[PDB]
Design a protein around this ligand. Structure first.
Ligand code: HEM
Length: 293
């Protein structure tokens, strides 16, 4: 019925092996700091880990991070994936240095690394994704649109098994990076510290004086006087009563947010995967800084 995707550890690799993949990504983040006006690749890597996992469909178990399908042209050229080719090119040299790691493992680990190196919470990670054939490649149109409301959001997230708390936690990733007119038809940074992971998203949502305006792509976006932007979908988080109390909580307790994000991020990344009982426990990578590197 529903595919079964069983996690299979890359033959003979242990934690120390993954730790080295992480340090390599981390060191390259540190070094290629000029990308996107000095934002770095942090933000784009997180978005890549989310896009490759976001095609999951809890109904027939297709999509999700398992198969590393993003590697195939059909998924690669998904209009909703515009701009991700940048994170991809960043990871190639790494892949070339550690060719035994599957695609799905590499892509998702990049997401984890970026978060943790951007001072976010530690995200437990599990290895075992296995590259699947080009034909397991999900059709385009599974990633969400930005021009909708709270109802759309709720509904969408339901396909990935996420509840309200999880949706709002995960959305605080929008404190990172920015929108790029040529990629999405939206333009502008989401906040001020755009490569440091904090509860900024929530605070901005509550505290700014937002103006609905149309952009040069002729789409509507919420614009703040401080020069930030919010998508309709971000904004809807304060339109929905259920969502808004969660926003409030997060605005109030970065710690709770960090706890919730961590869980929800991991869940997103592990959707559709079966972990045999003998599978190693989730790894918790040290940062460069914890290693004194
Ligand atoms: C309704 C759900 C979502 C929608 C509609 C959405 C849409 C977008 C759009 C349109 C962009 C701008 C891309 C560009 O023009 O370069 C963006 C950026 C971004 N998204 Fe989301 N997103 C959603 C949820 C998420 C989630 C769940 C995460 C991670 C948990 C995430 C992480 C990011 C990051 C970090 C960026 C900034 C990327 C950069 O600076 O290149 N987003 N998102």
């Amino acid at each position: 019925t529903p595919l079964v995707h069983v996690a299979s550890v890359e033959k003979g690799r242990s934690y120390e092996d993954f730790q080295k993949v992480y340090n390599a990504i981390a060191l390259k983040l540190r070094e290629d700091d000029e990308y996107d006006n000095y934002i770095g690749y942090g933000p784009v890597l997180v978005r890549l880990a989310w896009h490759i996992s976001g095609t999951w469909d809890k109904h027939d178990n297709t999509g999700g991070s398992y198969g590393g399908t993003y590697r195939f042209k059909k998924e690669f050229n998904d209009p909703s994936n515009a701009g991700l080719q940048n994170g991809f090119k960043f990871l190639e040299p790494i892949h070339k240095e550690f060719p035994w790691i599957s695609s799905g493992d590499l892509f998702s680990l990049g997401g984890v690394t970026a978060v943790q190196e951007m001072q976010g919470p530690k995200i437990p990670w599990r290895c075992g994704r296995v590259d699947t054939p080009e034909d397991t490649t999900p059709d385009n149109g599974r990633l969400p649109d930005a021009d909708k409301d709270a109802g759309y959001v709720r509904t969408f997230f339901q396909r990935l098994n996420m509840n309200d708390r999880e949706v709002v936690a995960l959305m605080g990733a929008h404190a990172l990076g920015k929108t790029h007119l040529k990629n999405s038809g939206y333009e502008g940074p989401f906040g001020a510290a755009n490569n440091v992971f904090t509860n900024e998203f929530y605070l901005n949502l509550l505290n700014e004086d937002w103006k609905l305006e149309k952009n040069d792509a002729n789409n509507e976006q919420w614009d703040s006087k401080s020069g930030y932007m919010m998508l309709p979908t971000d904004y809807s988080l304060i339109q929905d009563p259920k969502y808004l109390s969660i926003v409030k909580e997060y605005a109030n307790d970065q710690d709770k947010f960090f706890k919730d994000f961590s869980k929800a991020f991991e869940k997103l990344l592990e959707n559709g995967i079966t972990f045999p009982k003998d599978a190693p426990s989730p790894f918790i990578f040290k940062t460069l800084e914890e290693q004194g590197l």
